[PDB]
Amino acid sequence: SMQEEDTFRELRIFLRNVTHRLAIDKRFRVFTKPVDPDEVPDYVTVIKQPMDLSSVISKIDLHKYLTVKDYLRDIDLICSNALEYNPDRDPGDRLIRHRACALRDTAYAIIKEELDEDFEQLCEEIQESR
Numbered sequence: 001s002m003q004e005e006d007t008f009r010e011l012r013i014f015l016r017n018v019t020h021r022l023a024i025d026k027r028f029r030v031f032t033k034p035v036d037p038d039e040v041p042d043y044v045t046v047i048k049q050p051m052d053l054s055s056v057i058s059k060i061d062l063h064k065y066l067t068v069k070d071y072l073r074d075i076d077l078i079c080s081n082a083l084e085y086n087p088d089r090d091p092g093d094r095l096i097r098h099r100a101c102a103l104r105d106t107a108y109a110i111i112k113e114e115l116d117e118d119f120e121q122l123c124e125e126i127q128e129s130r
């Protein structure tokens with residue numbers, strides 16, 4: 001239905017908006033681009049599923065996210081990746097970890113204040129119908 005198409009369009013608009021607000025925050029600049037594969041060759045095989053906010057925006061546009069649940073799974077992945085790759089006690093790693101927990105916490109906070117639970121539920125019930 002056109003009504004279902006319209007619902008998924010509203011979700012994409014919503015997710016693009018959350019993602020943009022993350023990507024323009026100076027704290028989250030490191031998470032806006034893939035890890036350059038030369039600058040860092042070991043990334044690839046330490047991190048099984050790389051993920052960044054640019055990839056998130058491409059996945060939105062390719063209609064990969066049918067629920068906010070699915071989108072927050074990728075944000076959790078950016079955070080978990082950052083914590084796993086940068087575990088050390090040194091200030092370099094600790095700043096990334098702090099920033100990666102802040103990205104996570106900010107995304108969940110935006111969604112908690114701005115996503116209608118009835119919109120998320122609709123999205124889940126359409127998704128379940130596929």
Ligand SMILES: CN(C)S(=O)(=O)c1cc(NC(=O)CN2C(=O)N[C@@]3(CCCc4ccccc43)C2=O)ccc1Cl
Nearest residue numbers: 030031032033034035036039051052078081082085096
């Ligand atoms: C910080 N971590 C390594 S992370 O939390 O695991 C991570 C990182 C990234 N993305 C980046 O680090 C982007 N990035 C590069 O790979 N190289 C850049 C671009 C070229 C200029 C430059 C100069 C200095 C340092 C880096 C770079 C850059 O911005 C994405 C996700 C995660 Cl989880």
